[PDB]
Amino acid sequence: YILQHADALVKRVSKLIVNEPAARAALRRGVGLAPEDPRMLAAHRVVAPYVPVVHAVERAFYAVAAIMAAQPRSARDQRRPNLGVSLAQAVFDKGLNADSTEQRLHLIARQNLDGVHRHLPRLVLYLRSDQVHIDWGILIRDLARWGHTPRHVAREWVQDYHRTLETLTRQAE
Amino acid sequence: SDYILQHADALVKRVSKLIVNEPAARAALRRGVMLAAHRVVAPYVPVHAVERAFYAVAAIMAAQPRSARDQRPNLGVSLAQAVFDKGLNADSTEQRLHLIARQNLDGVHRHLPRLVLYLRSDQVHIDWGILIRDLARWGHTPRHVAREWVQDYHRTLETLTRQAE
Amino acid sequence: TFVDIHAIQTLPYSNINRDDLGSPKTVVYGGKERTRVSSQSWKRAVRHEVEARLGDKAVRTRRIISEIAKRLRERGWDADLADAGARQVVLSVGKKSGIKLEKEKDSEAPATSVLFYLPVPAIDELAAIADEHRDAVAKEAAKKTPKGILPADRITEVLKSRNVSVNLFGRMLAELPSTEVDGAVQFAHAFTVHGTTVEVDFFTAVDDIPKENDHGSGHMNAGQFSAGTFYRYANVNLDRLVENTGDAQTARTAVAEFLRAFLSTVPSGKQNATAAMTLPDLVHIAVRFDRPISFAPAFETALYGSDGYTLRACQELNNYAERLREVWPDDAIRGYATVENKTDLAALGERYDSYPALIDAMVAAAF
Amino acid sequence: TFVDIHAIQTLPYSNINRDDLGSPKTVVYGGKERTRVSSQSWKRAVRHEVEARLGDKAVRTRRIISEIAKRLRERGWDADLADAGARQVVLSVGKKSGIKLEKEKDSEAPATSVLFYLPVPAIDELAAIADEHRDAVAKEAAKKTPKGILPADRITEVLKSRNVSVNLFGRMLAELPSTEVDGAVQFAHAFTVHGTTVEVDFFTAVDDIPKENDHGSGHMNAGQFSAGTFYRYANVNLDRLVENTGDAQTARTAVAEFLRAFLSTVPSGKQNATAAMTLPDLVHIAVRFDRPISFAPAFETALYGSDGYTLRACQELNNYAERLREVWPDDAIRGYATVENKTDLAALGERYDSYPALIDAMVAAA
Amino acid sequence: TFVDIHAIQTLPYSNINRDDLGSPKTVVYGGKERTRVSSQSWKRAVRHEVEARLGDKAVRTRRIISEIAKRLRERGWDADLADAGARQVVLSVGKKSGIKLEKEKDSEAPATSVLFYLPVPAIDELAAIADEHRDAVAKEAAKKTPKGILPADRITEVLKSRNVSVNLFGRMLAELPSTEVDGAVQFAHAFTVHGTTVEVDFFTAVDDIPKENDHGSGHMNAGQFSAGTFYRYANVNLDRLVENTGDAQTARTAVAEFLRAFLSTVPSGKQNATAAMTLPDLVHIAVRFDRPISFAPAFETALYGSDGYTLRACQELNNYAERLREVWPDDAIRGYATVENKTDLAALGERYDSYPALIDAMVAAA
DNA sequence: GCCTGGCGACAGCCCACATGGCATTCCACTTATCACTGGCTTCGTCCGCG
DNA sequence: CGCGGACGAAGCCACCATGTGGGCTGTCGCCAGGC
Prior knowledge:
This is part of a larger assembly, with two copies of chain A and three copies of chain C.
Chain A: H1 2-19, H2 21-28, H3 44-47, H4 55-69, H5 73-77, H6 83-92, H7 98-108, H8 113-129, H9 136-145, H10 154-171
Helix pairs in contact in A: 1-2, 1-4, 1-9, 2-4, 4-8, 4-9, 6-10
Chain C: E1 2-11, E2 26-29, E3 32-37, H1 39-54, E4 58-61, H2 64-74, H3 79-91, E5 116-119, H4 120-132, H5 134-142, H6 152-159, H7 164-169, E6 185-187, E7 190-192, E8 199-205, E9 219-225, E10 228-237, H8 238-245, H9 248-264, E11 282-288, H10 309-327, E12 336-338, H11 355-366
Antiparallel strand pairs in C: 1-10, 1-11, 2-3, 3-7, 4-5, 6-10, 7-10, 8-9, 11-12
Helix pairs in contact in C: 1-9, 2-3, 2-4, 3-4, 3-5, 4-6, 8-9, 9-11
Chain B binds a DNA duplex through helix 1, helix 2 and helix 7.
């Protein structure tokens, strides 16, 4: 359901990065920190209207908007897959190292909600840095469900990653 | 903090009745913005932050202009409606809002009375009990309260723009 | 090889440097809040006084294309060819296709994404390089997506030219790492010796023509201000400044001029409403060879107050300078100059009667 | 056999060491957030000052092939033979076919996957080894997939050479476990004695050449800085440093030089914007024989504030040093040197007037 | 007959013990995640310090054949006879044909499937047993499938020899259940008193040669670290340690040495990058006769925070010790030693000025 | 005894800003290791111990 | 030499699926007058 507010946030913000600089620059200074942190007080003008009503959903929305605006200029310039499908696409196509990125994904899958946020911006900006595609609404919904799921979303992330890597390798034959 | 709120509401109606009924004690409260506040507000107390959170609001309530003096949303929505209804400038009241959200507990009491008395001057509704409790929760946790005000403010301003169209 | 200059300077209800909301910038240092003047501000005031006094000015601008366009337009180019030629100037250099540009604005040439920092005559030389190749520019101006025709080496050689300010404070250009220059000056954030609470000043703007049934002010607000005795510190790495300018004589003039600018200039923030133009109460130039040492820990314990902080700040900086010379022995050539004569301040080295005499003595002591 | 050095050092609005987003690194220690300077940074500053002062420099590089290529090119080799010879240098060693290389970059020699850490004259000796076999290299340069012709033993003996920095901090090479050296120094993460909230600093880069006299800047941002009195700690395992250098005299110079670097150096991260060059307020060198003990638990209870933390931090480190010497008895040779004279600080051992006098006394005591 | 030792010990940004992915090991205890140091790690650090201090070392190795081969080679055997003789050593014992061996590796003697755990002089005695029968070994070395010629009883008697570490921590050998020794020590997993979120540190190893154009980090990653006040607990079953060593005097030295190792040692996990060496803030040795009791339930309710956890952890362990002595009455000889003097901590028994004085008093009391 | 009312005099109104700006490159590792044991039958023979 | 314990002898069978929540608490203004 949340995927709806998530898609509205992804659209408006995806337009916001390209058209108005002061807004995305007001968004990127809040990457990876809880909304109570004073560096986030400037991001409420953009994000606060779109969150329904647990902090888990707010942290998902606010954080993905911040990671979304912190894309490098090159990335910003240019079925529904998860972040794991985006990972496997960055392994097979863009040539990222395999033993390390699989290790980093199975490293994310153990954190709690507090830890995922700590680890995610570095990984996502790594992925985004080489034009890997990531559907932000799915990542939002997933990050909102990370709080109440012990591993119910992460397992989906890991399974899809391994599976998509196997299929991408078998299609190359 | 639910128990802080009950005393805030009983103090609010007591002080409101005292403000409209007696000018001597009400003027005794407006001077602080101090012994008379100690002989008036003191019974309605359950940390130094909650006491200042009571005496400051009782003095601010007693300093209203008589237009506002004769006549649950918090202060972010009170500023948003003050923007939407009275036509009060939003770009500037937003800066005064973020400037309030940065201060600590002694500074929030340095910048609050001016904006609040400016709200009462425009006859905008301020739920005095919640503002009291929020100032009391401010010594306990400042960032949560400040963010709540900012988010609610920008959020109810947007909803009121959807209602406009 | 390290010239470091310390300075105590009081400012009276100045509010020279404001944050994003108008309040003066503060450090919670030593556990107590102390208003501060950011280093980039006083550094900007220093570079403008140095450029104005030494005559050569450098320009930090996001709009280099437009400026090259005025020079090509004064060289006889048509406005459209001047714009296309300046686009060729920024298009012909860098790893990628060209220096990226900000979104195009109506009627005006687009600003580069990053701030260029180059002397003025170098910008004019870029105009001459775009000028010699006028026909090739005219041919690429007709194409839909013109490419960088101008020679990259000549342009990169023009963009490497250094002003005194570039030699002194350094520059950074991410697309052209060949042009980056290491700064030779460390400029600390000037904070107060004592704890300072922000002082709110309510003010109103009078409406001059009066209308019946209204006396209200034309405007009302409440700006913020503060005052106090700031501690100031700065370094000059002589090895890097000599490496940047190349010759030791221009480095010598650059150092003496920098130190004088450090003493003379004031950031000019809100100065017309608050005339806070002031000379430092005490200055202490040390010429150290091993490493620079700021005396900022000396004022980590905030001063109590009620009495003038100048004498206690000078005396405290004296005791900390004495204790550091005992704890960390060195042959550094010291020297100071003070307004107050109530104390000798023995540890700050040889006393000089005037700031220019002190600067000349310590610069002459460093070559 | 263990020399450990403690130090209290205030830094004023420095922000010397930044995370990935620009904020200074923080520890939530004792329940309260405290900004920290990572050990890897101050260790790098220490190794560069030690190499610069002791004269011998080691090089941690991912691009060894390119550097060997400049030496072979200055020896008279053609550029293509210099590149093929340096590829032979890294191809001739290791278990597998060769040291694995990163994906090839246009116009430049490929970087090795792992960071080599070797002194500069050893790299030149690798160039000489690739030099005397020039004809064999020329023959393998013609083949499509040349093999490691150079002797592996000679190259592995060059890659085992140790700098003072290698002797002191150790190295790691996964493909050549014979070259790994155990570090002789434990360098702790310098955290603040007191709790510190990150200080946002709004800044603008004003744009010259105004367009229409409007004051709109060319840039606007907010970089976050912080200040405070850091606690610093470090160990030197004399048995391993003596084992690495071999002779006790070079280990003695290495230890004295390390301690002086520990006191003198500052990481230099964002210094031209905030000049944070400062000497430590207090230093306490202990020469312990049983085991090193950091006094970091002494500052687990964060200091309250409002008053200068230096005197209370020195006095608190004193009380914890006293209480540990009573609780854990030892014959360790202690000694300290301080700027403040307001207190005697009796537990920190014999007082010395200056940092070099203290270092010389405790190194001579070990 | 039960000596149990409790200890509160803070570690600053240590990350001493890592999981398989590099994160510090955590317990979700009391509903709140708390970083932990596994017992096997601190137990390994304790056994190495005990062996190093008491002089006798035991060896847990999968490659016993190769080591017996160096001893037979130094006794004058040919390399091939040394290898065949060591194979005879492991072939001559056990129910089945011999101790099962891992798949053969080129150029090296095969490792046994299970980890042997025996003192060093016992391995040398196994070499002597294989040595006396050199001609029989030479005859079986010529056959395609040689059988276990050596006497099984003599070898099994050598494999039964016990080190202090074997007496203290026990051993297990599935093929030779006669050699299994019951451990006399229960070592708990040291967890934090308070809830700890895993702190991430982002580091970048810098390339040293300057790039001509693009300067960037040589490698960049993020390693997880954490800090906190750990609770530590351990038991020593005096009846089993006396049963293992046999004589009460060696058991007495083993217990005193164990307790001192428990207090002194630190697992050494990235200690060269964190310097987590620290003495415990509080130690409490009880000599109980009925049964050992850990005070871990005392810290099941995680501490809130914002203030130093040491004083509250010591005071909470005090209240739980008091409440247990009232609820479960006993004549156990108690005793404690603390760094803080802010509290008397009456329930932890008689206070002693120093850790060695406490250990000597409670060991002498048992 | 309970409930209700009262305790010199304590001001009013008007007023609340516009505009502009918000960076960009680069870089992301290797190696080695990965347990055993048993939970069938009856009987006969051998070896060890007493 | 006798008894007890341990070991041995077989017969053995293999292109794409996921949604939930709600239960705990207390307070004045004081004194005097009248009913």
